[PDB]
Amino acid sequence: SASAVYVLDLKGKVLICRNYRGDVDMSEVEHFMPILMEKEEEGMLSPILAHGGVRFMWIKHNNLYLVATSKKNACVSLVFSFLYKVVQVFSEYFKELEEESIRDNFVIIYELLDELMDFGYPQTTDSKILQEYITQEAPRPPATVTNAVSWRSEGIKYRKNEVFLDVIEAVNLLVSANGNVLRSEIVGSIKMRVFLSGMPELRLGLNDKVLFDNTGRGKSKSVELEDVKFHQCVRLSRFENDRTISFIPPDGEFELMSYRLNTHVKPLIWIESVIEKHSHSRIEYMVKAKSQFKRRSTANNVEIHIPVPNDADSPKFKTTVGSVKWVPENSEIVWSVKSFPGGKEYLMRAHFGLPSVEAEDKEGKPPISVKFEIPYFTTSGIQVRYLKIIEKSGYQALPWVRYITQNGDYQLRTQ
């Protein structure tokens, strides 16, 4: 129940404002900046502000804060969802999200803001559907918005029918300083770029553990996805009935399903790091990286970030494989490895100086995070079984998909 959706800037100036109900004065935005400054300086800053009887709930963008004022007991989750949809629409329409496009795309920005939400209740949020009625370079609105299918425009024709899938894995490991992993969860991400003719009804089929158990084949390798979040095109009733994933793919790239299940296996990359930091004399980084993944998979662009001292200077890196560089901007040693074959072992021996004068305040111990990304390797073992592409006209589709394994929240707690 947002009262006025406005876009701020880094200097407190409102780049664009669009009131939806008018129950909140437009002058309340001026007090948002002092309130945010006071909250930040006292540690009480939150995404949802409160200027007396009006709450300023907004998120932080790349360069401006999309603060949406409200007065009644409006849904905070609804406001956040509307802000996220607006950000996604802006990203789809404008390749950059900064002040350069706010002051240059006002003619289309105002129209998009007016069409997106009326009276604080959003009605249209599909970028592809919205691009057929509001353009910066007007006909009647498309029937897709009025029709039930609001995520697949009818009449789309292509020379070929090729759909590219992307099974992107997110290996997140929360390893404590004691050497044990606390939070080790893998979140799947099935992002497909559907490019077909017409409005095909894709029938996604995978080797799900529940599906295998229901069919009676609960004995082979099946992915045990604890949480499965289907897209808007995916029919919730069909999935709830008999695990049938049937939905109409959209035109372009979109996220169909987002699996998320816990992982009880050993980490793909094991980092054994030591800190022989002398008392204001020197420091040693005996960091060893052990690859527990399969030898047939190579972790391309492996970047194990080792947090070095903030005031360390004149550092020396004695590694074996991969270039090691220290970035003073990040205050850490980036153990960058181009190709990391499975089962390999890279040993590094850091050595950096330290000023004689001790630091005035503590700096903390940021966790060490690795940036391993091994393509063609599915840690969860989930494999796509079938993709039922059915069209009324009748055509031979050529679906495609690739499996990519990377590191998500794979941080290692320091000592």
Binding site: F164, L165, D166, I168, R203, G205, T215, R217, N300, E373, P375, Y376, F377, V384, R385, Y386, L387, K388, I389, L398, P399, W400, V401, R402, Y403, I404
Partner: peptide, 18 residues
């Protein structure tokens, strides 16, 4: 070629489950 694993063709349905 493509970084992150070469794209592989997908099936149409579970042919072994009828």
């Amino acid at each position: 070629d493509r970084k992150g694993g070469s794209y592989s063709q997908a099936a149409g349905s579970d042919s072994a489950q009828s």
